[PDB]
Design a binder for these strands. Structure first.
Ligand SMILES: [Mg+2]
Lengths: 67, 221, 124, 226, 255, 207, 49, 79, 293, 239, 279
RNA sequence: AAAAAA
């Protein structure tokens, strides 16, 4: 199995180009993601309601936006 | 970087062109100046309707980016104040990906730019200057700058690039950079080394483009 | 937009009473902004019959006018007959050139490129 | 020949006064003259000849239009598909009248010239020249057949008298013809087979674009219908 | 779409103490309807109701089999109004309202659809509104009621899946009813006409199950113009009005 | 989907003391905005309401204003779209009595209510009085004329909105719960109304 | 306009340059990449996340 | 100026009390000047059946940006 | 946007059809000469009829079949028209009358005719299968949308070869093109559509009808009736679609089936030939590259 | 199952030339539309409402010469025994039928005498069991007549299935899934077809024999509609 | 509440149908419902064959209201633009009302706006069949002081006067288009046809300030009987209304007249009465 | 939403 990360970004009080702000907000959000463990007793898959592990991303590649 | 192009392959369109680079083949078409819709009317300048469709499937958000990037290039080129309150339909259809369309869209972007500009010439629209776009890539291992790469060269590439420059005075003097796209891991030294080889190769295609127009336009006159 | 027998515009701001103005905030790329129409007979008191609309206004030019009748619930009817009304801010070649200023009532010049375009100017 | 590209330097010195024209653009700010199209620069007069299939309204140009609408103020005539409409006034006809209006239905072919054509204003045409005996073929074009060609083929046919088309077609058949600068050519004959023979020739001549191939095409086309 | 001269006339007539309706009805009178049932062989149950104004609603009842442990809702009501979108405001409102009216834990017994300990019958209710001159929430309600009274399902064989190839089961339940009320001035009205709702100050949507008032109960605006606030005594009066005149309508639709 | 990026379609989603905070006029994109946060017991609710208007409608011959309300799911996808439309219809039935429509002929007022965060440790019944509070604040902040302050309360799933100091009712929402709670819910929500009213008035004066 | 995605490591990710109103001198790129590096280094460590 | 609030909307916001209903894995609230940005990260599980630093090794996320301008309808070319 | 046609043209073309003449100098039962050119990749095919220019690209992907048909595969056609063919066509319009018609016609010719085997596209029953998509690109519009899109799709599917797949447990693996040769899709028969255009002129008034085959853009606007019949070399009718238009006898309907069978048979042998010439073109090129090793 | 018995019978017991139960209804919804019809052909139950000719909704849609003929076919989810979870509203097969029906009646209905008007046809299919396309045609024909809308002649629909070498008339869903069918539309009593539709595979060898049964079979359909219409006309003219 | 539960189910006049040949004589003048094709006359609709003088036509069983010059009709304003008013008379097209066809006393929305009802006369006809309305009269104008009700257009025949005064101090306006208006009898209504043998308030939106309950219930009852006569497909005349209004007095409550068995009773009562005293 | 006679 493999994890898939869906994201939803809401923007309020738009003034100028928001791509720079949407990226930065997404980066901060990605810095703190916890992936809940899964288990199984065609079979389905069940995620644990408690146990989870922190998402490991490359901090060396982490960038930020500016216009 | 041997390419091939034709002018005026379509009949019912005001202007059209067919660009070929490696395996990626993008045919373009231009109709204008024509009557614009109420929602597209611009009292002073000229309206631009840009449409880019892929080789497989339906146009998605990916192609919406291609249209947006293509718009940034064709906008300063066309003299908008020559056709007040009018419309120009620019449609670019990609016949073949010529790459991995899922991972890279920068090869097709340059071809969409090249084909569009040629169609603008054929349709007889007011242009402030000329333009030429080339795809660039940097391999992770060799760390060399390759102008107009192939499909297999992109898969092992570390960073992909896209350069489009505006040319004046016999296709020699560069007025301003129209489009500069870059994706992947790269430093500042690789950037100025990219324009050093890019501007040289861009002018090579500019003078290459210029002779294509001469061979096609002159017999009509 | 410019037509032959009239000239339609859109309302941006309205002058207050005793200068100060009241800016009407709206989207110009939708059409929610109030639209108004200036008749060819309401251009100037001088020679009301024959008036060349091309030599009076221009697409993009700012025009200070006074509303006569509201008419229907779509377009407002303005006029620039008096001296303090006419094209205020404008640029050369539909906005492509440099800024132009108002000198004569029927002539607008640009003290930058030396360009002169025929407009309907107001009194400073 | 001297080929020109957009953005290139202008060979003509700015010292000597030179009148402008189509093909070149006068920059409203920098005041420099630059080419905006691709073609051959013709200097007698300064203009650029470029390939274009789309017509634009211009003063003193003969055009063939189709009535797409009838209003109370004027007519709505389309000189070409998808292009903006043109205003044909009721008083733009010979022997005009006030209450009585000229008889033109929707779809009628009209041969008129463009009087006033502004870039930011609706163009206007008149069915009487200003003036050349009021009869240069102006008016309603009854029956016949029209053909769509590029603007390059249209202007050279109407202006240049050395063009071997009206010369070679006159020998094959006797007919009256009207050519517009919007890429429209109206040709009417007696028998329908002759009109069809003329349509197939221009269709092939415009495609191949060869001055010395006119007599060759016209010979095989007129012998094909028989 | 009435003129102001009509609206001002109907308001002064309805708001009066001896409230005069345009059709002469008393505040508790219902307009004559017509109900057809069991006209669809392909469906387990069907109903059709014609109103006075020409309003018409067709309700179809069908069913299938599924586990009731994996499905909390065994009753799905779908509403399709003619000339209206499926994502329309009024359509999705009624679609959401009726689902609350007919629910497994609201006004419908969940043990009635229980066959075995594993599998149970899930009922699909479809609604087709041919014509609507008013709020069909009451019209549809009377149609779904008569549709569930006359229903036939595949008859079970074993106990706690197999079915009977010929004999069938007739579902006997007590389907909820929805009565729309109109608040005009200080008077309450039952079954508001088309023209009455356009001048009504406010309105009430009241449900009914097992000889008692039940949820959902809403306060809907019958129009967008003459909508005004109302005194709390009108809600107590309206509810009581539905309470006493409901055994009359239930008794009528029972035959 | 060629409109958004839904990702792989062969995948499946994840399977496993009253306190108020009011803030208005923090959005420069619209004419009026409001933020409402309520925390009680083990259930807190945070929603945002934006008001765009009144803006002229071309060709409109309406002698009064036109209100449109839409609820949205900001983060957690819980409430059904069908149910959101129902509340929206309920909310518009309220403010059409509250908003002085005679002031805005040939005009329309659009109201967007974003349901951001709602923690729960019927269901949407409890959020209704907060939506009314938010809208009434956003409308009053926008400059829209309101005949009276609209407020409500939730008691055992029974929501009832009051104006004119609880003397009259502008909305009634009854779902689940029980019976014979008519007099009780009317008295309990009236206290919540008066409480929400004074905090709403204070909110507009202070900032 | 100029769009930059700079990393604290010193490298770059996304580079978007489109000139439509004026010439883009190389001195302004170096000025942009300089300002984008500090901007990205400031956002990298600010809230200690 | 930039001021943010991280992990405020996530289910893992509180260590002791974890939300049983919330399906947000990671979150962020951001406001730079006047513009406010609210990001929420959700997840999913998919069965993989197929057959170094390159493009094929690295993946990405699927974002759905909703820029609110006060107009109803489909997603604009911006989003 | 709509195409403006003069009254003089409408009278000229109509009168010419009464004299058995047409603008492009063709016959009434004659079909435009079709040239078929294949691109570098397999499945890519360009079809050109006179001035009419179309393009087709066949693709494939691993997906899950419908719950209604777990033993079958998936097939879908894209006939979206870009303004490239002309300003007459709007951007992104699937609600077009003649546009949805062309899509359904060629869909009935492939799916319901049993042309392509969807059962052979099923990898695992009720789990995973192949999904064949055909995107028709309408380059230039001179008429004959239905006809040209019918050849392009059929010629493309027979020139398309899907990668060989081997099942290992519940895991589905994909073999590269260099390791193994791709297996071509199975086609039982090749359906081809022929479009008819009917005219009812005045004057010379009792009995008079004109029917032509594969009308141009100018002839397509003046027709009073539309008929599309799909036939193959198997002596059977794949599908025929006549909606309203000029009412015609059942005899004239089969009269158009006989004129069409001589046309579809001629070009089907042309497709198979151009498939044969291109198959051996890639064979001789594969042997030459190996000989220089 | 046995579709066609060697004794000359089917699943229902009908012959090869026997039509199903054919019942028509006129003016069933006078309170809803200007004209209405309830077509009951076999198991098929269709309600057709014709509204018009009336003023268009917006000025965007108006013809100064002819009228505007619009057809909306609402396939209910409870039609077939198996309820479809998705609505057929925007499906390709429905957009085809709607457009086809319009082109059919565009020439039959005299639109030129009703200028600047709009004729709206709303169709609701309560139940479908084979030959649905033919039944839709019969629904429109009667409904347009009740609305008093001038047309040139009748348009009768019929479905003809082909099993082996023996053709069948008025087929059901079970037969349509077991063989190829040919739907027809006949103008009046003539041999001129208004509509010709073939989906599945049909031998070119046997085609004229198939249509000839269809045209003749559709003629009996017309007579049954003519009978009911006259039967309804003589009752109300009695007064 | 009344219900009806049914289970299991859902010199002669020639009747013709679309496509049928009515006559082989080309002498006759082609009228409505018939189209000409090669000296033969075919019927385009289904109905009765109408032979009047030289004119041959076919009368449809059902059809919308056909506007004729001189018809007194009641209409509602559908839209207002430029210098015209487009009124809905329940026909095929919207009737038009020019600015010169109304009464100007000493912004058109201040006179007549969308929604307003009025009674008028068909001044003339357009080529498309549309009607030109004319309100310049003391008998025509904007409607008020009552209620509107709609009956089939084929139930109201033309007459010299369509405005009748009835007992109960109310007035009916029987429009040929089927649109009917009941209102309180005013000064004009009382003495109209009699004085013949012997102005800013005309566009007012406000009704009469004093509407007695005796008139409201009269307006109410008069509406219930008209729609009752229409329910039995009986031609509405001034006599049929008065008779029905008196025959409905046997029912104390007005609301009892809404029932199906009650409407058909009042209808059958007039049919049998006029048949008994008519012969 | 102009139109016909003189
Ligand atoms: Mg619907």
């Amino acid at each position: 199995w493999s994890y898939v990360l869906y994201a939803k970004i809401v923007v309020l009080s738009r003034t100028g180009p928001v791509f720079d702000l949407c990226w930065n907000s997404l980066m901060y959000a990605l810095q703190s993601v916890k992936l809940p463990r899964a288990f199984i007793d065609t079979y389905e898959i069940i995620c644990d309601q408690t146990k989870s592990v922190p998402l490991m991303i490359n901090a060396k590649n982490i960038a930020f936006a500016s216009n | 970087m041997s390419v091939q192009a034709e002018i005026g392959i379509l009949d019912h369109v005001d202007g059209s062109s067919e660009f070929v680079s490696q395996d990626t083949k993008v045919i373009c078409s231009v109709t204008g100046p024509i009557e614009p819709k109420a929602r597209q009317e611009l009292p002073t300048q000229l309206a631009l309707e840009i449409i880019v469709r892929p080789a497989k499937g339906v146009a998605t958000t990916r192609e919406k980016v291609l249209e947006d990037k293509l718009r940034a290039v064709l906008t300063p080129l066309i003299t908008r104040h020559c056709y007040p309150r009018q419309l120009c339909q620019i449609t670019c259809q990609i016949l073949e990906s010529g790459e991995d369309e899922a991972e890279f869209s920068l090869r097709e972007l340059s071809c969409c730019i090249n084909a569009a500009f040629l169609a603008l010439v054929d349709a007889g629209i007011a242009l402030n200057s000329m333009c030429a776009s080339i795809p660039i890539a940097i391999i992770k291992d060799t760390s060399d700058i390759i102008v107009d790469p192939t499909a297999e060269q992109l898969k092992i590439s570390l960073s992909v690039h896209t350069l489009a420059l505006e040319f004046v005075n016999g296709g020699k003097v560069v007025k301003n950079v129209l489009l500069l796209d870059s994706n992947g891991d790269f430093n500042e030294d690789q950037l100025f080394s990219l324009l050093e080889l890019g501007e040289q190769k861009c002018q090579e295609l500019v003078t290459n483009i210029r002779r294509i127009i001469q061979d096609n336009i002159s017999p009509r006159l | 937009r410019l037509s032959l027998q009239r000239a339609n515009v859109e309302i941006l701001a309205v002058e207050d009473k005793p200068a100060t103005f009241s800016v009407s905030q709206a989207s110009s790329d939708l059409g929610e902004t109030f639209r108004g129409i200036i008749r060819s007979q309401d251009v100037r008191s001088t020679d009301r019959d024959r008036v060349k609309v091309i030599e009076c206004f221009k697409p993009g030019d700012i025009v200070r006018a006074q509303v006569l009748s509201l008419g229907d619930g779509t377009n407002y009817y303005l006029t620039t007959a008096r001296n303090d009304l006419g094209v205020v801010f404008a640029r050369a070649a539909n906005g492509a050139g440099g800024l132009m200023y108002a000198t004569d009532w029927q002539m607008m010049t640009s003290p930058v490129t030396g360009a002169t375009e025929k407009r309907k100017c107001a009194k400073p | 020949s001297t080929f020109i590209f957009p953005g290139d330097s202008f060979p003509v010195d700015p010292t000597t006064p030179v009148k402008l024209g189509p093909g070149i653009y006068c920059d409203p700010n920098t005041q420099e003259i630059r080419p905006v199209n691709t073609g051959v620069l013709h200097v007698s007069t300064a203009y650029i000849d470029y390939s274009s299939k789309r017509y634009i309204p211009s003063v003193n140009d003969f055009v063939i239009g189709v009535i797409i609408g009838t209003f109370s103020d004027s007519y709505k005539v389309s000189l070409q598909n998808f292009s903006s409409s043109v205003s044909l006034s009721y008083m733009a006809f010979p022997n005009a009248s006030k209450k009585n209006r000229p008889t033109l239905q929707v779809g009628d072919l009209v041969y008129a010239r463009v009087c006033t054509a502004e870039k930011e204003l609706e163009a206007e045409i008149e069915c009487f020249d200003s003036t050349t005996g009021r009869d240069a073929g102006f008016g309603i074009l009854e029956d016949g057949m029209i053909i769509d060609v590029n603007l390059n083929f249209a202007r050279q046919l109407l202006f240049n008298n050395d063009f071997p088309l009206l010369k070679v077609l006159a020998a094959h058949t006797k007919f009256e013809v009207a050519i517009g600068l919007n890429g429209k050519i109206w040709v009417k004959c007696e028998e329908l087979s002759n009109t069809l023979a003329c349509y197939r020739t221009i269709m092939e001549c415009c495609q191949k674009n060869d001055t010395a191939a006119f007599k060759d095409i016209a010979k095989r086309q007129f012998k094909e219908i028989l | 779409s009435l003129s102001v001269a009509e609206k001002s006339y109907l308001y002064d007539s309805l708001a009066s103490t001896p409230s005069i309706r345009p059709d002469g009805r008393l505040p508790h009178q219902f307009r004559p309807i017509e109900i057809f049932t069991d006209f669809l062989p392909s469906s387990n149950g069907s109903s059709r109701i014609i109103a006075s104004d020409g309003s018409e609603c067709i309700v179809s009842i069908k069913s299938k089999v599924v586990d009731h442990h994996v499905e909390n809702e065994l009753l799905q009501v779908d509403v399709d109004i003619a000339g209206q979108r499926d994502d329309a405001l009024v359509v999705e409102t009624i679609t959401s309202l009726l689902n609350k009216v007919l629910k497994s834990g609201s006004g419908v017994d969940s043990s009635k659809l229980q066959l075995t300990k594993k599998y149970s019958f899930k009922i699909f209710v479809d609604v087709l509104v041919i014509s609507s001159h008013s709020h069909p929430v009451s019209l549809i309600s009377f149609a779904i009621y008569s549709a569930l009274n006359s229903t036939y399902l595949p008859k079970l064989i074993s106990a706690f899946p197999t079915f009977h190839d010929y004999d069938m089961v007739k579902l006997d339940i007590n389907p909820p009813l929805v009565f729309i009320l109109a608040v005009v001035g200080n008077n309450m009205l039952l079954d508001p006409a088309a023209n009455e709702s356009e001048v009504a100050n406010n309105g009430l949507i009241i449900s009914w199950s097992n000889g008692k008032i039940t949820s959902p109960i809403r306060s809907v605006a019958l129009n967008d113009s003459n909508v005004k606030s109302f005194k709390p005594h009108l809600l107590k009066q309206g509810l009581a009005m539905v309470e006493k005149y409901a055994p009359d309508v239930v008794r009528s639709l029972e035959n | 989907d060629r409109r958004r990026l839904l990702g792989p379609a062969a995948a499946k989603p994840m399977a496993f003391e009253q306190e108020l905070s009011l803030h208005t006029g923090f959005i420069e994109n619209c004419n009026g905005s409001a933020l409402v946060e309520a925390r009680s017991l083990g259930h807190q609710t945070s929603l945002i309401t934006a008001v765009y208007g009144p803006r002229s409608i071309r060709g409109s011959f309406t002698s009064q204003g036109t209100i449109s309300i839409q609820l949205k799911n900001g983060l957690l996808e819980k409430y059904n779209t069908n149910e959101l439309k129902e509340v929206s219809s309920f909310l518009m039935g309220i403010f059409n009595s509250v908003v002085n429509l005679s002031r805005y002929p040939k005009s329309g007022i659009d109201i967007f209510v974003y349901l951001t965060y709602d923690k729960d440790l019927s269901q949407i019944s409890s959020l209704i009085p907060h939506c009314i509070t938010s809208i009434t604040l956003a409308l009053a902040d926008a400059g829209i004329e309101l005949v009276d302050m609209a407020g409500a309360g939730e008691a055992n799933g029974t929501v009832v909105s009051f104006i004119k100091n609880g003397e009259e009712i502008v909305g009634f929402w009854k779902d689940d719960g029980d019976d014979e709670d008519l007099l009780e819910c009317l008295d309990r929500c009236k206290e919540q109304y008066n409480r929400y009213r004074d905090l709403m008035i204070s909110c507009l004066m202070n900032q | 306009t100029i769009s930059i995605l700079a990393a604290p490591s010193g490298n770059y990710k996304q580079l978007t340059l489109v000139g439509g109103g004026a010439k883009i001198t190389p001195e302004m790129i170096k000025r942009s990449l300089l300002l984008s590096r500090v901007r990205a280094d400031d956002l990298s460590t600010r809230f200690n996340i | 100026d930039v001021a943010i609030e991280n992990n405020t909307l996530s289910r893992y916001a509180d260590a002791g009390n974890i939300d049983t209903k919330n399906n947000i894995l990671g979150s962020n609230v951001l406001k730079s000047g006047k513009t406010i940005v609210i990001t929420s990260i959700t997840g999913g599980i998919i069965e993989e059946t197929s057959a170094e630093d390159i493009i094929a090794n690295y993946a990405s996320v699927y974002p759905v940006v909703e820029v609110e301008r006060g107009r109803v309808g489909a997603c604009t070319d911006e989003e | 946007k709509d195409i403006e046609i003069s009254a003089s043209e409408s009278k000229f073309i109509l009168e010419a059809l009464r004299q058995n003449y047409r603008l492009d100098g063709r016959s009434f039962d004659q079909f435009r000469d079709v040239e078929i050119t294949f691109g570098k990749e397999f499945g890519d095919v360009s079809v050109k009829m006179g001035n009419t220019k179309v393009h087709c690209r066949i693709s494939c992907q691993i997906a899950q079949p419908y719950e209604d048909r777990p033993f079958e595969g998936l097939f879908v056609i894209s006939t979206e028209i870009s303004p490239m063919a002309g300003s007459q066509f709007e951007n992104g319009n699937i609600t077009g009358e003649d546009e949805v018609l062309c899509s359904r016609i060629i869909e009935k010719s492939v799916r319901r005719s049993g042309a392509l085997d969807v059962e052979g596209l099923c990898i695992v029953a009720g789990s995973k299968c192949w999904a064949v998509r055909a995107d028709v690109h309408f380059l230039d519009c001179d008429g004959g949308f239905i006809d040209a899109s019918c050849i392009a799709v059929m010629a493309g599917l027979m020139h398309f070869k899907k990668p060989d797949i081997t099942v290992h447990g519940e895991q589905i693996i994909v073999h590269p093109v260099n390791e193994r040769e791709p297996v071509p899709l199975g086609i039982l028969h090749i359906p081809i559509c022929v479009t008819f255009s009917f005219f009812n002129p005045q004057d010379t008034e009792t009995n008079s009808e004109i029917s032509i085959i594969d009308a141009t853009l100018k002839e397509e606007l003046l027709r009073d009736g539309v008929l599309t019949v799909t036939l193959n070399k198997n002596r059977e009718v794949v599908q025929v679609s006549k909606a309203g238009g000029l009412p015609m006898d059942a005899l004239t309907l089969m009269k158009c089936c006989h004129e069409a069978y001589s046309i579809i048979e001629k070009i089907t042998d042309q497709i198979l030939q151009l498939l044969k010439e291109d198959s051996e073109k890639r064979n001789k090129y594969a042997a030459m590259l190996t000989s220089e090793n | 199952l046995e579709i066609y018995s060697p004794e000359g019978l089917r699943l229902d017991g009908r012959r090869w030339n026997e039509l199903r139960r054919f019942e028509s209804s006129i003016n069933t919804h006078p309170h809803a539309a200007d004209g209405s019809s309830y077509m009951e052909q076999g198991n098929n139950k269709i309600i057709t409402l014709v509204k018009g000719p009336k003023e268009p909704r917006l000025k965007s849609q108006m013809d100064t010469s002819k009228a505007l003929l619009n057809v909306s076919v609402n396939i209910t989810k409870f039609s077939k025994f198996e309820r479809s979870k998705s609505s057929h509203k925007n499906e390709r097969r429905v957009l085809e039928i709607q457009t086809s029906l319009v082109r059919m009646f565009e020439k039959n209905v005299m639109l030129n005498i009703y200028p600047r008007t709009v004729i709206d046809i709303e169709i609701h299919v309560l139940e479908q069991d084979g030959g649905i396309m033919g039944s839709l045609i019969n629904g429109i024909t009667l409904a347009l007549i009740d609305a008093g809308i001038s047309m040139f002649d009748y348009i009768s629909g019929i479905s003809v299935g082909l099993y082996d070498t023996t053709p069948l008339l008025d087929t059901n869903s079970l037969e349509e899934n077991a063989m190829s069918t040919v739907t027809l539309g006949v103008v009046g009593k003539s041999e001129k077809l208004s509509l010709l539709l073939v989906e599945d595979k049909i031998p070119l060898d046997r085609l004229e024999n198939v249509l000839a049964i269809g045209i003749a079979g559709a003629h009996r359909v017309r007579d049954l509609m003519d009978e009911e219409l006259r039967k309804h006309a003589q009752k109300r003219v009695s007064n | 509440i009344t219900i009806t539960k049914r289970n299991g189910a859902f010199s002669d006049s020639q009747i013709v149908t679309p496509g049928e040949l009515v006559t082989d004589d080309p002498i006759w003048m082609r009228g409505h419902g018939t189209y000409f094709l090669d000296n033969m006359t075919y019927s385009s609709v289904a109905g009765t064959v109408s032979r009047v003088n030289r004119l041959l036509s076919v009368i449809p069983l059902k059809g919308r209201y056909a506007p004729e010059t001189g018809d007194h009709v009641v209409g509602r304003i559908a839209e207002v633009g430029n210098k015209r008013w487009k009124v809905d008379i329940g026909g095929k097209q919207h009737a038009v009302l020019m600015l010169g066809s109304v009464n100007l006393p000493g912004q058109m929305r201040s006179f007549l706006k969308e929604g307003d009802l009025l009674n008028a006369e068909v001044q003339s006809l357009f080529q498309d069949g549309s009607a030109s309305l004319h309100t310049r009269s003391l008998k025509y104008g904007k409607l008020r002081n009552g209620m509107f009700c709609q009956v089939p257009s084929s139930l109201i025949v033309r007459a010299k006067n369509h405005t009748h005064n009835l007992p109960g101090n109310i007035t009916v306006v029987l429009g040929v288009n089927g649109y009917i208006w009941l209102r309180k009898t005013s000064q004009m209504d009382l003495a109209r046809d009699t004085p013949s043998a012997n102005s800013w308030q005309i566009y007012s939106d406000e009704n009469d300030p004093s509407i007695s309950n005796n008139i409201r219930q009269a307006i109410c009852r008069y509406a219930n009987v008209i729609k009752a006569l229409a329910f039995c497909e009986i031609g509405i005349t001034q006599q049929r209304i008065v008779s029905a209004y008196e025959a409905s007095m046997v029912y104390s409550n007005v609301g009892e007249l809404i029932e199906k068995n009650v409407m058909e009773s009042i209808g059958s009562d007039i049919l049998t009465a006029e048949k008994m005293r008519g012969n």
